[PDB]
Design a protein around this nucleic acid. Sequence first.
RNA 1: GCCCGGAUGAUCCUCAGUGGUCUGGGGUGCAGGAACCUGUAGCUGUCUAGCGACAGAGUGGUUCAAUUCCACCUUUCGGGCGCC
Lengths: 474, 474, 447, 447
Amino acid sequence: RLVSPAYVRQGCEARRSHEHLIRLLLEKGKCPENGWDESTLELFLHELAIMDSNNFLGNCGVGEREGRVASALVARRHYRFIHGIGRSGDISAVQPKAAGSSLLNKITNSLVLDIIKLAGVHTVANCFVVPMATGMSLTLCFLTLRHKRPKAKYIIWPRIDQKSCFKSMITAGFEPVVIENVLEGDELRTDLKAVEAKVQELGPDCILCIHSTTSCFAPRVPDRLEELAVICANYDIPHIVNNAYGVQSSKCMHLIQQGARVGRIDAFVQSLDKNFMVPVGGAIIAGFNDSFIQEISKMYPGRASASPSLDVLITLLSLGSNGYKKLLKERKEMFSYLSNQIKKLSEAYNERLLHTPHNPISLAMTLKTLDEHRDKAVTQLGSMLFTRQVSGARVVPLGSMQTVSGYTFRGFMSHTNNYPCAYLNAASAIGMKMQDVDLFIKRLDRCLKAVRKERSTEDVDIEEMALKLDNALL
Amino acid sequence: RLVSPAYVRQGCEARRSHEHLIRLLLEKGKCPENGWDESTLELFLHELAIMDSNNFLGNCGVGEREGRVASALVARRHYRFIHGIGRSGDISAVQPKAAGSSLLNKITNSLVLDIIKLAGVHTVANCFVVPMATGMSLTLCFLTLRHKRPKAKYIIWPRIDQKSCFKSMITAGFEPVVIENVLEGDELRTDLKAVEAKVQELGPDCILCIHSTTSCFAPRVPDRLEELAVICANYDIPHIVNNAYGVQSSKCMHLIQQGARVGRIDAFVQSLDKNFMVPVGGAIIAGFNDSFIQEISKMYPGRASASPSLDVLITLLSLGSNGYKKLLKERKEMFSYLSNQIKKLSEAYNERLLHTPHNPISLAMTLKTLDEHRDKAVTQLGSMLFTRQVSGARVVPLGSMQTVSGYTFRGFMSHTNNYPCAYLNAASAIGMKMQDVDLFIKRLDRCLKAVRKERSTEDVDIEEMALKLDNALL
Amino acid sequence: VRQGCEARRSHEHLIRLLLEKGKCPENGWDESTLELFLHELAIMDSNNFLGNCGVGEREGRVASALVARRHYRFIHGIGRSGDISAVQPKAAGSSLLNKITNSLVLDIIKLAGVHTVANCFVVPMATGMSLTLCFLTLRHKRPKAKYIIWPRIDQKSCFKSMITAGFEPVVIENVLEGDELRTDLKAVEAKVQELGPDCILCIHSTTSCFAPRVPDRLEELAVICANYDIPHIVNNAYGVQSSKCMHLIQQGARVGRIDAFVQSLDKNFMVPVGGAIIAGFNDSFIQEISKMYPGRASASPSLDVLITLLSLGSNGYKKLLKERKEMFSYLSNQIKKLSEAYNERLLHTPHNPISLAMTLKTLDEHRDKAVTQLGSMLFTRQVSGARVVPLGSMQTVSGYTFRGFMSHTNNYPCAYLNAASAIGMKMQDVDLFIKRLDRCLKAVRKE
Amino acid sequence: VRQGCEARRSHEHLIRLLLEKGKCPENGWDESTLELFLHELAIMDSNNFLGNCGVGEREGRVASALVARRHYRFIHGIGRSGDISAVQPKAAGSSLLNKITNSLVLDIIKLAGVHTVANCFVVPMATGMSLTLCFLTLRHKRPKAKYIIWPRIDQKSCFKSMITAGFEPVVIENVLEGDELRTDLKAVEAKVQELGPDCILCIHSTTSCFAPRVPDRLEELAVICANYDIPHIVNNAYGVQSSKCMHLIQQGARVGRIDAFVQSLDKNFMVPVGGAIIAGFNDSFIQEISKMYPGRASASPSLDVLITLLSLGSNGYKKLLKERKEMFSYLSNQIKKLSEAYNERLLHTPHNPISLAMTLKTLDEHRDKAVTQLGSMLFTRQVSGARVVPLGSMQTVSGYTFRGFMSHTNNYPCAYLNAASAIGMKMQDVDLFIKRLDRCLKAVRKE
RNA sequence: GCCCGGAUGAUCCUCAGUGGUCUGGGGUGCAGGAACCUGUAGCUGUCUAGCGACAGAGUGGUUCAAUUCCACCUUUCGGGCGCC
Ligand SMILES: *Cc1c(COP(=O)(O)O)cnc(C)c1O
Ligand SMILES: *Cc1c(COP(=O)(O)O)cnc(C)c1O
Ligand SMILES: *Cc1c(COP(=O)(O)O)cnc(C)c1O
Ligand SMILES: *Cc1c(COP(=O)(O)O)cnc(C)c1O
């Protein structure tokens, strides 16, 4: 029954090794260098969860929001964190009914701030995780700016053909002013002259902010943030940066750091899933003025989900800063490999890799040898890649017209009205493996052969199943 | 190695019993009457998850959002659903990269619509789950209305002292017009005269909407929705109903149904955690015009978390419509029991249960025998209940001034400037057990004794630990 | 913050109370307390140490994360290679888990009706192999013994356990007393005198059994064993759930000799098949059985019952025992009603508190094969546990031929159907069984 | 929609290929395929049927949801009460699980070096009790046998397995050949002739062992057994991970007689302690051992290794075997370097492919108790698996007194330290061990 | 249990018929002018101090038009399958 050496022999001795990793986390708020063992991580989460009042043993609840859970499957999959984050008046305020969830939220934001520094923006002052994706999080930035600039109606926006970040300004109730890009070689870049010309035409007081973008599909490249930040500093206009998946790119993060160094960056927003390999649904709002970032936080009404914060807390504690650095290194290596592989394949089909050296993530291969008008070969290629279980291979044909929330885009998906050619997108994002590139190259090869010929074990099953899906669509 | 009767002997025979429960769900989109076994539920989720492209065996990904997951703990706790819900242009659109998640989202919304009908609003036309809490979801309603009424500046709002729903109109960029309530007996009720007078004073075209509330703390009661809906129909003003935790109240839901029957209700919003016992973070936007509800959905920019939808899908499939009906029945029974218990206890301390028959969820017990000015006894009671692990027991002292987003409230937390007395809140919400009431009554008894005396095993450990927490705060 | 750190104290009190007294909690633990306890135990094992390095052949390495998590990172099993009950220095948490589990199990055995039990231990083998371990222990104490005297019960595991241990079973036929089959005490004592006590390894009796057989006459057998100095081993496979079976074991130990009694973990505690409990009244003999086990053993059955008893509590287990009795009365009455409608009757077996039997005399197996059919149809309608017993079934088990197999005698008067009220049975179980049995008898009567 | 339904076909192909050939997949399954497979198997068991009602005593009821989920709802165990290998009609999914697991295990045994193996089965007992089951089976074939001839190895489980089965071990001392302790073939054959083949139950040899002992001379023993018609039982506890041990078993069966060889599941497949594999070359004899097991048994060890082999694949297991060899060379060289710095040496034991030994001659146990200290300090520094062997240690196991215990002989020349490269060992393990051993020897030398 | 095929649900009480905003026959009670003639009829939820009010007719679909036609569900009948 007993065999009891007081509490336990090693019950606190080797347990001390776990507590000291936890104590170092709470004291300095930094990512562990090497990842925690699963046992340490789950011991930490279990001890946090029992701090929440809904998990108290002697608790009784007479309110309308007591964190009750009907399904045990639901309660266990969330590690018994039910109360979310924040209070009804402040999403950043400690919740007296959920001290464990509040500590979870504070530690997660501290870990994320640490990662943003090592990723490239060392002068970041403040950040917080918000359980909305990047589009809605950009909207929250604009909603906050409205009260600071009540006469403003326009958001000046260098064009990028992505529906979420475009709609974010309309959802916030402002009028986007689409600044077309300038073609420099193969690259589409910021028209700094047109941006400043529009500021003078409309008047700075009528401008809510300038909305720039770093991460993007080639042949677009990250915006000229340093020059845009200087324009924003000179005319006293807020600068909001869409950095959706730029955390994984030291080049993108350094553009942000330099923009804040020489000019004005009020906030930059990044997706959680794209930069940390977690489910879709969360984002980080970061900036350099602590007071302003807290203003955006206080703009949020009501409590919020703790699930995205828990996901990234688990991820960073398991990976460590070394594990994340390793993922960033391999992403750079896989970009070179993917670039070289596309160079080799495009040569064999009389295509080429578009020359986009300023885009460190996305690549583009021309599709000039395909006739979309007659054979619809460009659209056929995208469908054949899809049925062959290639995902993320974005096909951009010429002359696509698209209306988004009443605004009509010419040459939609190409970020400009008349790009020289149609092309295919591919990218080296965090977590990509060599198998992804090799299978993509192999399957793109077969698709290019089949479309050019049509104008004139499990591998064959994926091919046989693709032929059935191809014929069903036809 | 084999012993193989083709595939299996019963491998499809008793499996058929599982498939037929699943086929009935997908065909009619209704809640099962009796809850599913856990085995059926998890088989369903596993088969949905393998439909998502990130879980394909022969998949390769070359994009920036491929649903990659670094941590196995994260992937398993979400049943391998990574891609979220929706597309970057439409949160309601099927995601070709996540056919399983898209089916999950559609079935969840169908189940939730079914529950809203059986809960009382049988004429509901459309609804969707949004992974934001009720405050942010109300903001999304106002953001959608802005484009339909671009000259509107004001939201007419019968006062309720809750920071989230108040801030939701300011976060959306509108000016709330606070309509004070009328005291009728002990109850605070809608001042229909002042609402119509403010409509005429400001002009209907300047009114974005009327923002009413059903579920609320006593002594406030649900707004007079039928009369407000008639005012809204006559002046052509949209009507938005805050039904945060009203789904659990057949009285609240019937007010909504009658309001739509005789007048105009454009949308009503309810919390997921408060009505379905799931983690905080999600809500339902429902209405009677299908086209308008889709407009709110399309206002959302970008993809969204699937975690709240998964939580309520698991919950409703496990509970069934019978299980949910049982929770609603027990909530009514526990309201009577809690009411009778407070009647008995308040008598022994020369207090009374406030007469609020029109509030079917929240109750209030007077605290007239406590002196807040001299002894601060009302604040002391709330703290003593907290240290004794009573949660949800809301103490409302007199004369509290509070500023929320620049607007100053007199008598804050009482929903009126000068309520006759201080009081204590308690409620019978879904999932409450008799132990909650008995422990609340027992601990409130000890607290009342201690505060009145101060002016003149685990039970004792909760008391001994409360005395230590009480002295530390002092 | 200060309330949350004081909230861990609430869990610590429950854990401390368990380590100090080793009794089941009265009310079951919350899952949060249980999993907290298990995680703290598992990190005491050396394979889960953060700075551990392993240069041996048994380091507790786990290749699959799915395997490690589902066992709460308990990898080293129980015991040492020289003693299954010894503390494993490389697995202090697993050793603590094994000691607590044995304590909780002893607590339940007393609660269930054998208050005078002295010792017991969980063994990760089922009841058959656990009876074998008992016989293997008795061999070294009685090296001239060759026979095991065994009142007949038609169950292959307990019968084979004697042959596996290397002894010759001596089958004692039962006596028909009314409808019941009971111990033939005269035939037992006659075989003791014929073969000689020194040649008898033990008397192997059985409590829990299928009707119309009833628990053996343990008191009279315990006196025979005491008079002749012959060990007594009781097969109590699923008798823990029956206060009548347990009190019968308690009485036999009071008036006579009972060396050990064995019970299945899955049949009495609703856990997966695989474990058993060896219990006795001589602490030293039970220890001798434990020390006869060679090498380490799986900790999975111990962990299953530990989780179950901590989640149920003694009140939760008491409730299941009370409901088993009420379900038995309900099942009995419903069989009386149904048997009346088909010109059958419920066999009068008041000495069996778990299993019942209903006559199948009106069904013709000789001409229509109707009795064999009924059990087949009962399966396809998904009635599990219903057991049809035809007449004159011959069956060979390890070379021994049984006549009238499944009936525990050579010529029982009639064929019959078995049904039982075991722990965890619901009113749905009986109502479904009655409905499907009615439909099954209608179709057989038509043809 | 059409691509997702075709996506289940990809998983179905892997599952279909497993059921059709019963071999390990070359590359490991994804967790999604594995858990899909397990869930489909579990719903085949009757306890998981949606319309099931239970009126029996063994219905597979589970009180705790934590217990049910952690076992993937496999509750009924393996086998029937009359045959552990028979298909359980109430648990078709569990029976299918057991058959697949035995097939995968047979595939690995061939892959590991015994290509001529005919049959094998997983038994949810550890290696000690599994050797006991072998001896218990041999008793009925050789009812006059009393002795088991056993080349000495100082391990309590395999030694006790002979006594548990009820036989007298005949300890054959080993021969010092250089630094190695090897089989004394002349003494073995002399005991066969002295005691008489008819009185010998079997010869019980051992492959995997601690240095400086080496695997037994299986070929010469297999010929002795064939000439005298004596069964041969091989203790291969952790020899599956060694192509040298497995090939030695293969060669012995080719030139002589080997009736069965037994191996631990945890030591060879990195799963929790609790299971073993009994394998042989006569399909009928292995079946006889299986049928000697009485009653049902736990399915937990089978499920653990099934998950592990499906997740690893044969390529994954091959990789672990290759890395064990490379880790052995690395550990050997690092011990050579460290022993040189302390005026010690690595004992030359080239016939042992798993375990190594380093001399501790410069440490004084008689005056300073330094040898006993080193093992103590090695533990507190969290070095597990390191094994110090002093001189002249006396130890009694089940009544038999060993002199020079832990050393496998009565007077080995010196004390020494044991270290091994077992499957799953990392370069961190060796580097940490060398560093901590260096610090441990520095402190002992100071005092 | 599953598969197949009839009917079944709350005005394939009752037996029938009917795509036409339902009809025929037998039967019961309540109400008046043995049985005859006439009228009449039940249930569930919600909101009410109550009168009463608001809905629902297994869930959906087709159609100008569903008691009627189609699919599925509930109940029930019949057939098939049966070493567990
Ligand atoms: C719960 C509730 C809300 C919503 O608050 P959130 O934290 O945003 O979910 C709004 N108003 C009232 C009256 C509420 O009870
Ligand atoms: C991912 C991304 C966004 C954000 O889209 P959400 O679905 O809201 O997360 C915005 N702009 C770009 C360029 C992106 O890549
Ligand atoms: C591991 C091993 C055994 C196995 O003993 P158990 O604890 O019963 O598994 C037996 N002999 C030797 C030499 C071993 O290494
Ligand atoms: C259950 C039971 C056994 C146990 O046999 P195992 O399958 O080994 O657990 C033995 N005898 C009887 C009468 C039983 O009911």
